[PDB]
Amino acid sequence: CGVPAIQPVLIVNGEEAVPGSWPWQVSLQDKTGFHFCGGSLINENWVVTAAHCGVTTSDVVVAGEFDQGSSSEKIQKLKIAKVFKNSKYNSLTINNDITLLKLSTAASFSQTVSAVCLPSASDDFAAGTTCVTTGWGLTRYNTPDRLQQASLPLLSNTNCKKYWGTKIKDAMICAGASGVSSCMGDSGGPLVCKKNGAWTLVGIVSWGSSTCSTSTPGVYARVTALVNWVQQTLAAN
Template sequence: VGDTLGYGPTWGQPGGLLVSSQHTLLPVFLQDSTGYHFCGGSLISEDWVVTAAHCGVRTSHLVVAGEFDQGSDAEDIQVLKIAKVFKNPKFNIFTVNNDITLLKLATPARFSQTVSPVCLPNENDDFPAGTLCATTGWGLTKHTNANGPDRLQQATLPLLSNTECKKFWGNKITNLMVCAGASGVSSCMGDSGGPLVCQKDGAWTLVGIVSWGSGTCSTSSPAVYARVTELMPWVRQILEAN
């Protein structure tokens, strides 16, 4: 995950996925009252953020958008209040099924070069095993680091079939999950709730929400994500009713 997102020219990761700050996924971060970034998330519109249910977001938390470098004061960072938290009622902390929460913002985000939404998939979209996708976050680049990196990190990961993923994780893997990684890069601690995006018809599409995986940030076992295509009926229901 050693590359930095959004600095300098367009750069490529192994696997040939080219990403630049103008065209890449731009996650948001959830911050508690002490200023600690405890989870990631993704804007899906000016008014809505998607994150993981296990993050335990409350309306007292804040959404931070537009931040690439925690050491910089020069960025156009937006700090947004949360009006309502919609945790999927079927979320199960023991199986980690249905690990999705929608956040309705109290004031809309302003879209810019550094604040933009991801596209939602359709229920019937297919993202086959081997597809190269991307994940980002402030998560620790090595699990022994006490502090996350100052700059947003990005990794390119291949999707796995659930059959392949079960070789690592057994029957914990359900159809509500999708796996990626085990290719020398990992979605690490601190990225919970953040995006796994794949390109579809030229647009970054939210395929997974960082859910669980190896607590030691192993690069040889895949990370597990909530499978957004399976959760779209619930997402649509909440968006339409609110």
């Protein structure tokens, strides 16, 4: 996992990504074809997203897109067999914001469709570390056709509390406050960090500034606090 065939070359204030460079990035679409949330493939049969995306078996997982306005990409619209919302999820506090999507039919991995790595529960993602977030959410609080990316730093929970207070829980990790912002439509999408040459999912786009303020920290589901559940869920289904 985590090594794109098409190497990425480095959301409000983001940049257009190189087509197919974030192979695990999928798009959650309603019956209507409307993109409402991002997702990350972890294997050919499972997608990780935000519990708040409120995905159902009537939504579809779309893989391999770059330009959502395009009809010329070899994309995969996959049916969802079932929705696994983490029982620890608290919608009131947006805590433990993660849901697993089991596909009815397996994605066909290619150059443009592949898996992101998942970390170990004990892994350390240090404050100051520069990671990348991707997605098709608003670029202006203004919806892009083409997939955007942005490099941004991890913050420590303590420093994040400075902005958000008691809203930040252990199962949360803050990123941003750097001149870029994840925004409406980015939710469920990946926050990845590169190490020993591969990308690991450290966060799931969860919530942030009501106006996608670029000077405010973005909040993501801390994958290290949720990976045991991911593993438990895959093991059992």
